[PDB]
Amino acid sequence: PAAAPALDTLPAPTSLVLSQVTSSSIRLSWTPAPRHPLKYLIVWRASRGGTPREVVVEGPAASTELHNLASRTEYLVSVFPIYEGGVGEGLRGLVTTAP
């Protein structure tokens, strides 16, 4: 409905790496800013139309794995940093899971 705007001005992690792609999982990796957040918001959805899925992880996290993904499917994957100053603009990329 009313999605939450992201502040494009905030320390963000850098260099998103999407690896270990299986039929149902991908690994997400990023380079965190020197100031570690309280949390990170991670968002993934099927690129062709599907309800977005989310998980929030901690500030000093440098990795998390997404699971239970549908096979042969393209996902938009996003990483949102969560500090006290709001929600920051993050990293994103497309990955298609193995058959």
Curated annotation (Swiss-Prot):
Q: Which residues form the Fibronectin type-III domain?
A: 12-99
Q: In which tissues is it expressed?
A: High expression in heart, lung, liver, skeletal muscle, kidney, pancreas, spleen, testis, ovary, subthalamic nucleus and fetal liver. Weak expression in other tissues tested.
Q: Where in the cell is it found?
A: Secreted, Extracellular space
The protein's superkingdom reads Eukaryota
What's the stated role of this polypeptide?
Probable collagen protein.
Name by which UniProt lists this protein: Collagen alpha-1(XX) chain
Organism annotation = Homo sapiens
Q: Which part of the entire protein is covered?
A: 368 to 466 of 1284
